[PDB]
Each structure stands twice: as C-alpha cells, then as structure tokens.
Design a protein around this ligand. Structure first.
Ligand SMILES: *[C@@H]1O[C@H](CO)[C@@H](O)[C@H](O)[C@H]1NC(C)=O
Ligand SMILES: *[C@@H]1O[C@H](CO)[C@@H](O)[C@H](O)[C@H]1NC(C)=O
Ligand SMILES: *[C@@H]1O[C@H](CO)[C@@H](O)[C@H](O)[C@H]1NC(C)=O
Ligand SMILES: *[C@@H]1O[C@H](CO)[C@@H](O)[C@H](O)[C@H]1NC(C)=O
Ligand SMILES: *[C@@H]1O[C@H](CO)[C@@H](O)[C@H](O)[C@H]1NC(C)=O
Lengths: 118, 118, 118, 118, 118
C-alpha cells in the first residue's frame, strides 16, 4: 500500500492593512477679550495662464503616468485670518499591482507514477 | 490499496483592510467677549485662462494616466475669516490591479498514473 | 481499492474591507458676547476662460484616463466668514481591476488514469 | 472498488464590504448675544466661457475616460456668512471590473479514466 | 508500504502593516487680552505662466513616471494671520509592485516515481 499526496498550493495574496487615525485635539479658549479693528482689507490675487501647443507622452506607451504636462496647482495659499486646517488634505494612493503589467501564473502540478508491480 | 490526492489550490486573493477615522476634536469657547470692526472688506481675485492647440498622449497607449495636460486647480486659497476645515479633503485611491494588464491564470493540475499491476 | 481525489479550487476573490468614519466633534460656545460692524463688504471675483482647438488622447487608446485636458476646478476658494467645512469633500475611488484588461482564467484539471489490472 | 472525485470549483467572487459613517457632531451655543451691522453687502461674480472647436479622444478607443476636455467646475467657492457644510460632497466610485475588458473563464474539468480490468 | 508527500507551497504575499496617528495636541488660552489694530492690509500676489511646445517622455516608454514637465505647485505660501495647519498635508504612496512589471510564477511540482516491485 502506497499513498501519493501533493497538496500544491499556489497562493498570490498581497495585501496592505492600515489603522489610520486623525484627532483634531482639544482647543480651549476661556475668558478671551478682544478688540479687532481692520479697516480696508483689500487683498489682490491675479493668476494668468497661457499655453500654446502643449504635449505629453508623444511617443511610445508610458506604463503609469501620474506626472503632468505644464499645469498649475493652488492650495491654501492666502488664508488671511483665523484659518484652521485640521487633517485638511490627505492623499493616499495604495497600489498592489501597477499599470502595464503581465501576470502569467501557471500552477499545473504533475503526478503520473509509472508503477508496475508484478 | 493506494490513494492519490492532489488538493491543488490556485488562489489569487489580494485585499486591503483599512480602519479609517477622523475626529474633529473638542472646541470649547467660554465667556468670549469681542468687538470686531471691519469696514470696506473688498477682496479681488482675477483668474484668466487661455489655451491654444493643447494635447495629451498623442502617441501610443498610456496604461494608466492620472496626470493631466495644462490644467488649473484652485482649492481653499483665500479664506478670509473664521474658516474651519476639518478632514476637509480626503482623496483615497486604492487599486488592486492597474490598467492595461493581462492576467493569464492557468491552474490545470494533471494526475494520470500509468499503473499496471499483474 | 484505490481513491483518486483532485479537489481543484481555482479561486479569484480580491476584496477591500473598510471601516470609514467621520465625527464632527463637539463645538461648545457659552456666553459669547459680540459686536460686529462690517459695512461695505464688496468682494469681486472674475473668472475668464477661452479655448481654441483643444485635444486629448488624439492617438492610440489610453487604458484608463482620469487626467484631463485644459480644465479649471474651483473649490472652497473664497469663504468670507464663519464658514465651516467638516468632512466636506471625500473622494474615494476603489478599483479592483482597471480598464483595458484581459483576464483569461483556465481551470481545467485533468485526471485520466490509464489503469490496467490483470 | 475505486472512487474518482473531482469537486472542481471555479469561483470568481470579488467584493468590497464597507461600513461608512458620517456624524455631524454636537454643536452647542448658549447665551449668545450678538449685534451684527452689515450694510451694503454687494458681492460680484462674473464667469465667462468661450470655446472653439474643442475635441476629446479623436483617435482610437479609450477604455475608461473620466477625464474631461476643457470644462469648468465651481463648488462652494464664495460662501459669505454662517455657511456650514457637513459631509457635504461625498463622491464614491467603486468598480470591480473596468471598461474595455474581455473575460474568458473556461472551467472544463476532464476525467476520462481508461480503465481495463480483466 | 511507502508514502510520498510533497506539500509544495508557492506563496507570494508581500504586505505592509501601518499604525498611523495624528494628534493635534492640547491648545489652551486663558485670560487673553488683546488690542489689534491693522488698517490697510493689502497683500499683492501675481502669478504668470507662459509655455510653448512643452513635452515629456517623447521617446520610449517610462515604467513609472511621477515626475512632471514644467509645472508649478503653490501650497500654504502666504498665510497672514492666525493660520494653523495641523497634519495638513499627508501624502502616502505605498506600492507593492510598480509599473511595467512582468511576473511569471510557475509552481509546477513534479513527482512521478518509476517504481517496479516484483
Ligand atoms: C489596528 O489594527 C489591528 C488589526 O490590524 C486591530 O487589532 C486594532 O484594533 C487596530 N487599532 C487601531 C487603533 O486602529
Ligand atoms: C480595526 O479593524 C479590525 C479588523 O481589521 C477590527 O477588529 C477593529 O475593531 C477595527 N478598529 C477600528 C478602531 O476601526
Ligand atoms: C471594523 O470592521 C470590522 C470587520 O471588518 C468589524 O468587526 C468592526 O466592528 C468594524 N468597526 C468599526 C468601528 O467600523
Ligand atoms: C461593520 O461591518 C461589519 C461587517 O462587515 C458589521 O459586523 C459591523 O456591525 C459594522 N459596523 C459598523 C459600525 O458599521
Ligand atoms: C498597532 O498595530 C498592531 C498590529 O499591527 C496592533 O496590535 C496595535 O493595536 C496597533 N496600535 C496602534 C496604536 O495603532
């Protein structure tokens, strides 16, 4: 009596586990006395954009492209007064497998005993 | 008596587990006395955009393209007074498999014992 | 007596599990005394957009394209007074399999014992 | 006596499980005394848009295209007073399989024992 | 009697585990007396952008490209007064497998004992 056992286990299980927490804290203000005099608050902001014949990736493929061509990003630039930003901008990008990928998983266990018993 | 067992297990199970939390905290204000005098609050903001013949990816494929061509993003730029932003902008992008991917999973276990017993 | 068992299990089960929570907190204000005098609040905002012959992806395919051509996004830019934004903008994009993907899963277990017993 | 068992299980079951919660909190205001004088509140906002021969994807296919051509988005830009935004804008996009996908699942287990017993 | 056992285990399970925490602390202010006089607050900010024939990756593929072509990023630049930024900008990018990758996992254990016993 013979036993042939081949518990082949081809396992692909990538995974990210995250405990993510933001706490704004405790902000206490007691017996605050104030006298604020701000006449003539006249901020000026001028943004000008001109473009001619812009291009990006004018060639062969780019697998993953998060970069840009000539662009403009403006965030939180000119806060004048009592501006509170708590956990304001959280950008989380979790990628297990990127772009332009070829996955060829071949799990084909072979067991063909050529047994002759006489 | 013989036993042939091949519990082939081809398992692809990627997964992300996340505990995500935002707490704005405790904001206490007791006996706040205030005198605010702000005549003539005249902010000015001018945004101008001109484009001519813009292009992006004028070539072969891009697998994943989150980047842009000449664009403009404006967020939270000019808050004047008592502006509170708590967990304001949360951008979460979780991708298991990206774009432009070819997955060929071949689980074809083979067991053909050529047994002769006489 | 012989037993042939091949419990082939071809399993593709990717999945993301998320506990997501926003709590605006506790905002307490007791015995607040105020005197606010703001004559002549005259904000000015001018947005101008002109485009000529814009284009995007004038070529071969793009698998996934979340990026843009020349565009303009304006969010929360000029809040004047007592403006509260709690968990205001949450953008969640969870993709298991992206665009432009070819999945060929072939689970064809084979068991043909050529048994001769005499 | 022999037993041939092939419990082939070809299972494709991707799935996302989410506990999603927003709580605006507790906002308490006791004994608030106020004197607000705001004559002549005259905000001005001018938005101009002109386009000529715009185009997008004037080529081969795009699998999934969430990006735009020259567009304009305006959200929450100019809130003047006592403006509260709680869990205001939630954009959730959960995609299991994207666009432009070809799925060929072939589960065809084969068991043809060529048994000769004499 | 003989036993042949080959518990082949081909396991690919990369994963990142993270405990992430932000606490804004405790901010206490008691018996604050203030006299603020700021007439004529007139900040000026001028941003000009001009581009002609920009290009990026006008050649063969780039596997992963997070870098940009001539762009402009403006963040938190000119905060005038009482501007608090707590855990303001958190950019987390966790990638298990990058772009432009070819994964060929071949788990095909072989066990064919040529046994002759007579
Ligand atoms: C952290 O995550 C683990 C499991 O990954 C869990 O046991 C624990 O409760 C989590 N703690 C926090 C504070 O999120
Ligand atoms: C964290 O998630 C784990 C399971 O992943 C769960 O046991 C626990 O209760 C969660 N805790 C929080 C604070 O979300
Ligand atoms: C977290 O999710 C787990 C299961 O994933 C569940 O046991 C637990 O109650 C959840 N907790 C919260 C706070 O959402
Ligand atoms: C979280 O979801 C789990 C199952 O996924 C459930 O047991 C639990 O009650 C949920 N909790 C909340 C707070 O949504
Ligand atoms: C840290 O994570 C571990 C598991 O990775 C968990 O036991 C523990 O509770 C976490 N602690 C904190 C403070 O997040």
């Amino acid at each position: 009596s013979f036993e042939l056992t081949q518990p082949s286990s081809v396992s692909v299980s990538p995974g990210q586990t995250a405990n993510i927490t933001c706490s704004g804290g405790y902000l206490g203000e007691t017996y605050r006395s104030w006298y604020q005099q701000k006449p003539g608050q006249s901020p000026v902001l001028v943004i000008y954009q001109s473009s001619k014949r812009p291009s990006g990736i004018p060639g062969r493929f780019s697998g993953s492209n998060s970069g840009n061509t000539a662009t403009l990003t403006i965030s939180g630039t000119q806060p004048l007064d009592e501006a509170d930003y708590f956990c304001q901008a959280w950008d989380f990008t979790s990628v297990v497998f990127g772009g332009g990928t070829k996955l060829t998983v071949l799990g084909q266990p072979k067991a063909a005993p050529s047994v002759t018993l006489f």
